[PDB]
Write a protein that binds this ligand. Structure first.
Ligand code: ZN
Ligand code: ZN
Ligand code: ZN
Lengths: 199, 175, 305, 198, 194, 138, 155
């Protein structure tokens, strides 16, 4: 269309944050120092996957509401192409309107990422059975992303904001059960013209 | 007499009557060897100017009049349409030498082919018709199209340094 | 830079190609004494000085070619960055010393080894560096040093690699890594009995194979990529197709999943397992037939193969 | 009598994925990675660049209201009268802008890393599917040369606007997941065609 | 007299495509790939080398300021007088340059690969059509020798300038999409009698 | 039980006062030979191919179909049979697309109707009667 | 020309007996493997610097690796890391296996994965020593057999 929706998303981290490293060379280079590296850029920043978290949040809440929304989290499941999340994030037939970025941090790894030590306390004897060192992202670290909706509808900002409140409720990535990833979001959207750069 | 093996690196096309020749004749061999003599400025190139001076696919035995037309492939260019023989095939070279005066000149021609190659067929400047020599030497010496007083035989004599093309059309026997 | 003299920034030659030559004593244009001494020319401000010297003020660096020196010479009173001096001894010294703003690096040229070495040692003792002359950029990816005979030295044997833009220096860890990668690529090229003699199978009729393959083609278990890889593994023999269908049908003990695509429908778990073993037995009965019969079986579902 | 050589250097701000095109190379790579990258035989990364520029210019010029055709729907032909039809080619007339592939400066061991990607069940929060995909690291630089023959006045402006659109949207695959967000730098140079005739 | 022999060795930096002309082998190949590469019976790949050189010299010589033809443009028959008509030939006269087909030094089973190409919609951003076309890999070295009879002084320079124009523009097909950005190493020799 | 080397001895390097060259190839036995990967490409393909070896209204309808470029010379040339028309008409059930050329200038159901009309027209089409009318479309 | 490699593990592709083989063509015309290279390389790495195992049967090894894979002592992760350490040489794999088997005097733990199943402590120590002896015998074999053993368990 002639308009596009830009949602600038700013994350402030409230709890410790972990998202594990996925590059095999970087992870294997970090296993000689930490047992759980943070997913990190080659420009020494931190990136978090964001499209899957928003899609999982919206699918859980819209399945709870009773809408006809598919579950693309099941093993090799195919999206049907008629859901609202299928229109937003994508389907096998057509791509999604929302173009979610990675959550690149505003700070370099030496300023927000710290190396911590977790243990396994035995139930009797209260001793350290196992001990592992993992990397984490500190509290107060700021991340930025831009969600880009190509064909905006009236319910695109509301569902993205509801999914962001669900991500604030449950956590963004990594060890969500132990208390990691509890964050907060600021949203500054703007409907920009598609022919803006031409001039 | 020069026995030899001509291996085709690039395909060649000789139109006939739009029929095509499955194998090159000795006419194109004589014309191309004459260009070898002329461009290196051998005197025997003058002998190539006259019509008469009197000096086959390959089983090691050469074929006789199964090769067949299946060797022909239709080729469509930018706007052109023609057919050509595919390459990668050994052909017969028999340059019959009957005088001792031009035998060394013909051997020099053959040496220039053995260094670089020889072009037989249409679109010589486009790269069509490359023929590498594979074996050659010197030995002691109906089947082809023979002129006898019939089938139409068309051969041409494009004289260089006069800018004249004339395509002689005569009648002869069938091999 | 100066190549041994061509000094690009142009390619001006001082006493090759595309040059503005300036001859000395003691192309597109030849500049000599027309312009006399004390006068400047443009091309990079060029000024000549009498010897008994070319001075190019460029954007980066002010170059001075001296020429042969015999008698008090004539030197610029500005700023010199490079001083190209001939050597074939005290006359060159003060010619250097009596010049204001002593140059960054001097260059010795046109002489033997012993005289150039003696003058070079005399200039390092004056605390001015020398260069003694006699392309892809090169990258040390190395990491210990030594001090033998007043050179900082490292015993290293390695590999030089040449790409289109750079030449790198690597150690044995890189060669071990690429050797392991190429060994993994070489061993993943062959299976022991591909394209070999035809090799304990269930048997089933042709019409039942048609029915089962059509039913598992409607729902998405037997798909076009599945039939494609099945035909490609059938082309390399019978045991290869056996290994492929055993790999596809293999239920992982840790996760309880197989490599079949899940069916599109509302089937429960037992029925999905029945469809999976139906696909396994149907394709196992399909490996029994001849190659043309299996091609006529599978062209009706995957027209490519 | 004139060309407009544009030298484009592009730096990846996000991890970049483009897909392997060659079938033989892909099935060589499907034994280790489920999603290899487009690579040369000189071990360098390849990105298609003409289609991204054409799609960016077609989307922006259709949104502005100009009569630019869509060569993106199924088997549709260029009409031959648009600005994009003249710039990137129609069926009759060839393309004025000869767009080069985005060749990386580094090879595969420097900038290409294989990666673990997941599919997680929405309930029970467990990793359900796993696959390996190669991707290009952040900070990697790529070089392209766009040669415009018979240059009009607006060709630099339209190419720079298309490059800003590729900055905002992305280049390559997995664009919805955050892959391929890049930054372009343009060094244009007006060129006489007879420079080689020295 | 003397003859000029120019050996060109050709390294492709970008992929290369040249469509197959043989109708029999095209229809034999059009059940697996839709754009087959121009190949031989020896399973080698050859490129049309002549019209690229002639077109390079024709555009450059027309834009520098001399009198040349256009050629390959409907009924643009050659004039017979210009530099290109002397070098690469004309209709009434004959060519002085015998420019070979660019034969590759390797076979087709090591440098020619099937490849996927797409067409993607602009609103849905999904793959609307696909097609399989073969292409020549990067770093594959092609080899040709061109032969010039009766050379001028501005012959090696003109062939060199046209070669550099080919390294800019490209050779073969799909030139605008990035295919065919190659480089040339040139070696020249002048041969005579005996 | 002899040994022959089919690897190029060109590109020979020097290390430890030793001539050497690292290679990655295949050891073959029937003599024992060292063949490069290329020998293995020739064999695989070789055997893989070896394995492969084992009147008014209808004329008005082509008159209307030629103007919208659904029936181009690229169609009637391949026409000059029922299996080919069935393959061209075959809508793929996964993407919903036929192999016909789209019309120029039309709703989706209309374009489906002219696809069906082209199928019916080329299904309705002696060999000499086939040789007429198509000659006017080249 | 003399091959300095034993022609084992020799696959059967049609009437073409086959082996994927990586190595060096030394023109001294000998064809040696990477091991000769390392013994060459360390040679110069001590020369230029100067100028300035138990036995187990192949049936017993695959039976023991199958048994330890069933009780998850020898995991896929463990077989993979042993393969990368074995590709770096015999000494690196010896040091890695010695590190894994090493009983820490403070904690009393080994780096092996604990067995799955009801076992007594003595039998657990016997299983740990069985894994140690089996992989220690796997260092002794050449690389092509140690992959053909380990391909069945970690593809
Ligand atoms: Zn859906
Ligand atoms: Zn248009
Ligand atoms: Zn002319």
């Amino acid at each position: 269309a002639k308009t596009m929706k830009k949602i600038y998303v700013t994350m402030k981290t409230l709890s410790p944050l972990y998202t594990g490293e996925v590059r095999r060379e970087d992870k294997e280079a970090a296993q000689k120092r930490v047992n759980f590296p943070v997913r990190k850029t080659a420009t020494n920043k931190v990136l978090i996957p964001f499209k899957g978290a928003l899609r999982s949040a919206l699918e859980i809440m819209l399945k709870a509401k009773g809408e006809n929304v598919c579950d693309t989290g099941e093993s090799r499941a195919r999206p049907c192409g008629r859901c609202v999340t299928c229109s937003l994030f994508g389907s096998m037939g057509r791509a999604g309107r929302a173009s979610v970025d990675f959550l690149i941090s505003n700070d370099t790894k030496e300023q927000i990422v710290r190396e911590s030590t977790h243990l396994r306390i035995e139930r009797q004897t209260k001793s350290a059975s196992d001990t592992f060192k993992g990397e984490e992202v500190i509290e107060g670290a700021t991340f930025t992303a831009t969600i880009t909706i190509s064909n905006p509808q009236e319910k695109d900002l509301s569902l993205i904001q509801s999914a962001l409140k669900f991500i604030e409720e449950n956590g963004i990535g990594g060890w969500l059960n132990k208390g990691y990833g509890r964050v907060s979001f600021e949203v500054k959207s703007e409907d920009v013209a598609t022919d803006r750069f031409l001039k | 007499e020069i026995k030899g093996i001509l291996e085709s690196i690039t395909g060649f096309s000789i139109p006939l009557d739009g029929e095509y020749a499955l194998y090159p004749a000795g006419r194109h061999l004589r014309g191309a060897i004459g260009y070898i003599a002329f461009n290196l400025d051998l005197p025997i190139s003058s002998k190539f100017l006259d019509f008469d001076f009197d000096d086959l696919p390959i089983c090691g035995k050469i074929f006789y009049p199964i090769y067949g037309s299946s060797v022909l492939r239709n080729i469509m260019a930018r706007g052109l349409s023609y057919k050509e023989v595919i390459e990668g095939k050994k052909y017969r070279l028999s340059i019959i030498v009957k005088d001792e005066k031009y035998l060394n000149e013909m051997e020099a021609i053959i040496r220039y082919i053995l260094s670089y190659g020889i072009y037989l067929g249409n679109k010589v400047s486009k790269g069509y018709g490359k023929f590498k020599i594979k074996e050659y030497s010197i030995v002691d010496i109906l089947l082809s199209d023979a002129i006898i007083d019939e089938k139409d035989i068309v051969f041409s004599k494009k004289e260089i340094s006069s800018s004249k093309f004339e395509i002689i059309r005569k009648r002869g026997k069938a091999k | 830079m100066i190549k041994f003299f061509l000094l690009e920034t142009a390619k001006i030659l001082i006493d090759i190609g595309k040059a503005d030559i300036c001859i000395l004593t003691h192309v597109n244009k030849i500049i000599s004494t027309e312009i006399d001494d004390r006068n400047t020319i443009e091309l990079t401000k060029i000024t000549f000085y009498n010897n008994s010297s070319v001075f190019i003020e460029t954007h980066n660096g002010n170059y001075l070619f001296s020429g042969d020196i015999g008698y008090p010479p004539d030197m610029p009173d500005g700023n010199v960055d490079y001083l190209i001096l001939e050597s074939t001894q005290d006359e060159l010294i003060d010619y250097i010393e009596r010049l204001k703003y002593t140059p960054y690096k001097v260059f010795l040229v046109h002489g033997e080894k012993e005289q150039r070495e003696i003058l070079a040692k005399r200039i390092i003792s004056k605390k001015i560096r020398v260069e003694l002359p006699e392309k892809k950029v090169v990258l040390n990816i190395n990491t210990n040093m030594c001090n033998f005979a007043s050179y900082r030295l490292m015993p290293f044997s390695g590999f030089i690699v040449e790409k289109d833009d750079r030449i790198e220096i690597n150690d044995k860890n890189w060669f071990d890594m690429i050797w392991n990668e190429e060994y993994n690529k070489m061993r993943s090229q062959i299976v022991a009995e591909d394209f070999s003699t035809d090799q304990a199978l269930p048997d089933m009729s042709h019409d039942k194979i048609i029915e089962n393959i059509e039913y598992l083609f409607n729902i998405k278990i037997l798909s076009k990529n599945r039939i494609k890889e099945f035909w490609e593994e059938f082309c390399k023999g019978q045991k290869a197709a056996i290994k492929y269908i055993t790999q596809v049908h293999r239920k992982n003990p840790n996760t309880g999943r197989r490599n079949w695509n899940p069916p599109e429908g509302d089937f429960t778990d037992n029925e999905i397992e029945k469809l999976y073993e139906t696909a396994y037995n149907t394709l196992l009965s399909l490996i029994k037939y001849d190659k043309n019969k299996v091609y006529n079986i599978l062209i009706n579902f995957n027209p490519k193969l």
